[PDB]
Amino acid sequence: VHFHPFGNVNFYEMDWSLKGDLWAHDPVIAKEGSRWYVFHTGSGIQIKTSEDGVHWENMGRVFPSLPDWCKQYVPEKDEDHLWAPDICFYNGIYYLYYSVSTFGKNTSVIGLATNRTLDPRDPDYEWKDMGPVIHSTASDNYNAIDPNVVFDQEGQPWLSFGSFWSGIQLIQLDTETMKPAAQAELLTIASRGEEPNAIEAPFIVCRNGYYYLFVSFDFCCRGIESTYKIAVGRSKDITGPYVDKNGVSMMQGGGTILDAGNDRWIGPGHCAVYFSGVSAILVNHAYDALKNGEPTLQIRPLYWDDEGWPYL
Ligand SMILES: [Ca+2]
């Protein structure tokens, strides 16, 4: 897709036996030239790079320190770890969204940073702080974290986000500011319809006429005790209603489980989906049962059946 370009690569053909610096949580990927980049949760937003998409190495971070303005939104924030970044390339500009918050609370704000290139070796490399995108406070019934931008088939950009509380949110963005359009309304598109409303990390992609909403169910961040799972639903309209393979509404716990983990990789979640031709990859993290539950990067080929539903 134009905003997540990967060129001509047959994802199904390469061997995704990842090696190197694989500690990652809430990842997203971008490719520029022949280099691959992973952005994920960590101090100032952690960055990893690879020459082939298989062998990874730490590259640094986006922000040297917590941008000043963030402190006004989340006063309690006493460390520099930013979460769940999202990235897309539009009009020659890289838009990187990130979350500023504290665990289990909804006093949060999603920020935006831009750059013309992802290669730090380029003298033009520079992440610019573009300020607040959308926020939430204790009085709101949603949480402003876990952003994801997608463009509908009409070329209009939309921002989905959310974690617990009322669930997954969706709002229309302005192409110029890449921030919520002044007259845009906040919509709720997915919820476990249960408490705790364990649903978060939305990621939307368009595929052969349908918008697929990928989300993570249950509990992350508990190492080998994690119960994280990747679920998916779809809709012909980006605003919903999203439903799973069984036809269950995603506003009532609906969602087809794509992966619930195994004996080695526990609690897989917070995914991203990217295409190249008809091929695609599922990107996420999982807690390594053999390595003290360490969050680990996973990149695997993602197939699609006749009805249009994805599978690993
Ligand atoms: Ca995400």
Side-chain angles (χ1 to χ4, degrees):
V1 80
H2 72 264
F3 56 98
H4 294 330
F6 279 80
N8 308 317
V9 176
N10 184 169
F11 286 152
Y12 300 149
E13 152 177 48
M14 40 199 290
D15 183 1
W16 298 100
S17 304
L18 307 195
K19 303 281 187 173
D21 302 321
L22 302 172
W23 190 107
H25 206 272
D26 318 312
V28 291
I29 297 179
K31 189 179 187 293
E32 191 182 326
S34 65
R35 275 195 164 291
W36 308 59
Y37 301 93
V38 165
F39 299 85
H40 69 270
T41 295
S43 67
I45 298 171
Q46 291 296 99
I47 312 169
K48 296 180 181 295
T49 187
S50 174
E51 292 174 353
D52 52 24
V54 179
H55 305 284
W56 295 88
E57 59 190 309
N58 297 332
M59 189 182 98
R61 59 188 180 185
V62 179
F63 293 113
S65 54
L66 186 65
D68 193 63
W69 65 265
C70 302
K71 302 192 300 303
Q72 193 57 33
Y73 285 82
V74 192
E76 310 285 57
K77 185 76 168 171
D78 76 308
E79 36 67 43
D80 72 348
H81 295 202
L82 299 172
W83 331 328
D86 184 65
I87 189 165
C88 71
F89 189 54
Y90 183 57
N91 292 307
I93 301 175
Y94 286 93
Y95 295 83
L96 180 73
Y97 297 76
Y98 59 93
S99 316
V100 185
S101 181
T102 63
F103 198 76
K105 313 293 287 298
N106 75 323
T107 292
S108 321
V109 60
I110 285 167
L112 170 65
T114 60
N115 203 322
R116 292 284 183 176
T117 184
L118 300 182
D119 192 336
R121 298 177 286 84
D122 189 315
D124 296 307
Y125 181 88
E126 183 187 6
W127 284 106
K128 299 181 181 176
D129 186 353
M130 296 306 273
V133 176
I134 192 165
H135 85 303
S136 62
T137 66
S139 58
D140 294 310
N141 200 38
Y142 60 82
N143 191 2
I145 63 169
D146 293 4
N148 171 247
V149 172
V150 63
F151 286 70
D152 59 31
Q153 303 190 73
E154 288 176 61
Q156 320 173 77
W158 293 78
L159 170 76
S160 66
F161 65 93
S163 171
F164 289 66
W165 272 270
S166 74
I168 305 306
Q169 313 299 133
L170 176 73
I171 189 165
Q172 202 175 315
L173 296 173
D174 178 293
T175 59
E176 258 302 294
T177 69
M178 280 303 268
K179 293 187 174 183
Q183 293 181 57
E185 349 67 63
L186 194 56
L187 311 174
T188 299
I189 59 175
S191 172
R192 302 304 299 283
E194 171 180 47
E195 282 286 347
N197 197 190
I199 183 172
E200 70 191 359
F203 194 102
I204 306 176
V205 305
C206 179
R207 152 92 183 187
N208 298 350
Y210 285 99
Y211 291 95
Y212 290 80
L213 172 61
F214 292 78
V215 298
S216 295
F217 279 179
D218 308 317
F219 309 81
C220 70
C221 320
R222 294 172 171 194
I224 63 175
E225 274 79 16
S226 298
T227 48
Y228 229 20
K229 305 175 184 58
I230 298 173
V232 64
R234 74 185 186 181
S235 175
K236 291 189 177 185
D237 297 355
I238 196 172
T239 63
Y242 288 83
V243 304
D244 63 29
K245 195 173 169 63
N246 287 309
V248 178
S249 162
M250 285 192 86
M251 276 300 289
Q252 296 299 166
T256 301
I257 309 305
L258 184 67
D259 181 22
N262 54 52
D263 297 315
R264 171 64 182 290
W265 306 107
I266 300 175
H270 210 113
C271 64
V273 181
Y274 301 104
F275 296 83
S276 184
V278 309
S279 76
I281 49 171
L282 170 67
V283 183
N284 62 276
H285 73 247
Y287 305 92
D288 195 333
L290 300 189
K291 295 189 180 185
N292 307 295
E294 176 200 1
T296 309
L297 207 214
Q298 295 197 305
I299 302 178
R300 295 169 287 177
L302 190 68
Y303 305 91
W304 306 78
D305 69 18
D306 299 315
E307 286 140 280
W309 294 95
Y311 65 96
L312 294 165

